[PDB]
Amino acid sequence: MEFIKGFTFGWDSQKGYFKTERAKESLRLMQERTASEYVIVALAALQDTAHSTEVDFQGSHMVDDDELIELIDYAKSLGLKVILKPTVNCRNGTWRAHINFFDMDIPGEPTWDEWFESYINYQKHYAKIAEKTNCEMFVVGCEMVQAERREDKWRELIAEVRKDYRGLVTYNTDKYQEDNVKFWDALDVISSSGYYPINDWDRQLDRIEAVVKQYDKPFFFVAAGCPSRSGSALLPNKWDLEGAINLQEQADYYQVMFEKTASRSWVGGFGLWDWQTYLYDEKDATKNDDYGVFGKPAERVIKAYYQSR
């Protein structure tokens, strides 16, 4: 596995966004400003709650198949490789890591089998798209901490994705959960959300290295990044962190992350979080306290690092 110089795109997208000039201009700027060679197209279906079993990928929250194919083809026309990452959010705001059901099937209660049926059929739909567009990698789940114990069901899902899609298949675990997953052998690549504190990379990388050396798979941080807010460098996963704007903290987070990971040969790349489909005006960058790096000092740190690899 060559080093993946990646950036996540499309998380803010709604139906119709990918049809637009604005979306293509944003993706061109992502490539120009960061020297990324991969785009991670991150999409989210919706379910009602963390304990409901129907996964909706057809409403206004979800780009249509035709515009998704258009955007992937356009990314390829720019020379980008594409990683497709379809995940799921809850309408009531609960983090998908809490999606969970009773260990036993109780009459009248939602079951693991019902949820996985809906989720597998969701993934198979997008696996067919990844196959038709020749996406380089497909990510079958993201941060599903409580669902990860259902190893049998995850193995079933991966086999179903394999029937539709012949590329690389991975699963994206949450921070600190790299060893919670017991089905890495069924995947091609190990990946995690590397939202680790700026002052704890040495301990965390040593921990992950010991996990990764138990398998014969490449590894990368399919999500990583930091909002431009004070205190975010300590908890970079908290998108709602109460903190004043701080562009330099985000740049410093990135500088430390690349420095610490550059010396671990097994860190095989990054899918940096994240680049908006509808990008803010460069004039508004110094007021933006979110994950974007457009117009911020972190943009130069990323581009320099990606150009060096």
Ligand X SMILES: OC[C@H]1O[C@@H](O[C@H]2[C@H](O)[C@H](O)[C@H](O[C@H]3[C@H](O)[C@H](O)[C@H](O)O[C@@H]3CO)O[C@@H]2CO)[C@@H](O)[C@@H](O)[C@@H]1O
Interface ranges with ligand X (CB under 6 A): 11-12, 89, 143, 193, 223, 237, 239, 273
Nearest approach in angstroms of CB 244 to ligand X is 18
CB-nearer residue toward ligand X: 52 or 89: 89
DSSP, residue by residue, 36-58: -SEEEEEEEEEESSTT----B-S
Q: What is the DSSP letter of 188?
A: S
**219-224 and 137-142 beta bridge pairing:** unpaired
Nearest approach in angstroms of CB 105 to ligand X is 28
SS3 state at 287: helix
Amino acid at 234: L
Nearest approach in angstroms of CB 175 to ligand X is 9
How many whole angstroms separate alpha carbon 224 and alpha carbon 22? 25
108 dihedral zone (left: phi>0; alpha: psi -120 to 50; beta): left
Nearest approach in angstroms of CB 193 to ligand X is 5
Burial grade of 115 (CB within 10 A; 0-12, 13-18, 19 or more): buried
CB-nearer residue toward ligand X: 89 or 111: 89
Q: Which residues pair with 39 in a beta bridge?
A: 7, 82
Nearest approach in angstroms of CB 34 to ligand X is 17
- Among all chains, which residue has been given the structure tokens 């959300």? 193
CB-nearer residue toward ligand X: 72 or 99: 99
CB-nearer residue toward ligand X: 20 or 89: 89
Alpha helices (runs of H) in the chain, residue ranges in sequence order = 21-34, 65-77, 112-132, 151-164, 201-212, 247-262, 297-308
Smallest Cα–Cα separation from 224: which of 186, 198, 188? Answer: 198
Which value, in Å, is the radius of gyration of the alpha carbons in the chain? 19
Nearest approach in angstroms of CB 236 to ligand X is 8
CB-nearer residue toward ligand X: 26 or 237: 237
What's the residue count for the chain? 309
Nearest approach in angstroms of CB 60 to ligand X is 12
CB-nearer residue toward ligand X: 8 or 34: 8
CB-nearer residue toward ligand X: 123 or 237: 237
CB-nearer residue toward ligand X: 215 or 239: 239
Nearest approach in angstroms of CB 146 to ligand X is 14
Burial grade of 104 (CB within 10 A; 0-12, 13-18, 19 or more): exposed
